Ligand binder design. Structure first.
Ligand SMILES: [Co+2]
Ligand SMILES: [Co+2]
Length: 234
């Protein structure tokens, strides 16, 4: 037996984001017991999932745990990544594959939100959607945050955040792993809003806070352990 982890990030055009994601995934390697560990990206960034999967096989992996670096379960986790993995599986039929879940609702991510907020009551949680599983997840996370600290309310916007801002101290927490255009838009809209309401405060994005890392590594470990084959990928 020789276990591999294939990490799958979203990928990005933005230099800083490429750096944050690649340093983050390289940092994870020292925290995971598997002898073969490879990084790949769904879009824009090298290596691709194809190359990453191939890199694991080259290194003699018998088993590959594919773990998506995503905060939520929607099209990427449910459709795009597994269809790219199935191409790989057809190329390498004797590899046993397991496939993990996005972070989702995990009290560790809530701890990251607290920490980002503590770098500065209601909370406005801004993130990425038509998929209902995203509605469930973000509502879940808002309810955990709402009860883990003494805030008045938490309002997810996954509702157009622009309009929620147009409508008591308010924290705006971007529920995003990395920076980019959306983050630049939010930064701009809050910036303008501050002139109209001075009790609005924008935190940095959750990013790769150590509590996010904890949450991710819990995903990695359950996927690689694959209890009762529940993470088996066909
Ligand atoms: Co995307
Ligand atoms: Co399809």
């Amino acid at each position: 037996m020789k276990q591999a982890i294939l990490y799958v990030g979203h990928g990005s055009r933005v230099k800083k984001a490429q750096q944050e994601a690649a340093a983050f995934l390289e940092g994870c390697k020292a925290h995971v017991s598997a002898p073969v560990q490879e990084i790949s990206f769904l879009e824009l960034q090298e290596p691709t999932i194809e190359t990453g999967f191939e890199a694991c096989v080259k290194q003699g992996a018998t088993h590959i745990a594919v773990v998506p670096l995503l905060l939520l379960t929607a099209a990427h986790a449910k459709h795009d990544i597994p269809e790219e993995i199935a191409r790989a599986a057809s190329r390498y039929p004797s590899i046993r594959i397991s496939y993990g879940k996005p972070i989702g609702i995990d009290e560790e991510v809530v701890k990251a939100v607290y920490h980002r907020m503590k770098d500065i009551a209601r909370v406005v949680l801004i993130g990425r959607s038509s998929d209902p599983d995203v509605k469930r997840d973000v509502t879940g996370i808002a309810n955990l945050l709402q009860n883990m600290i003494p805030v008045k309310e938490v309002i997810p916007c996954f509702p157009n955040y622009k309009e929620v801002l147009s409508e008591v101290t308010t924290f705006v927490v971007p529920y995003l792993l990395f920076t980019g255009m959306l983050m630049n838009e939010i930064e701009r809209e809050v910036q303008t809003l501050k002139a109209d309401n001075p009790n609005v405060y924008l935190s940095s994005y959750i990013g790769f806070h150590p509590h996010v890392k904890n949450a991710f590594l819990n995903r990695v470990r359950e996927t690689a352990e694959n209890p009762e084959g529940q993470f088996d990928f066909d």
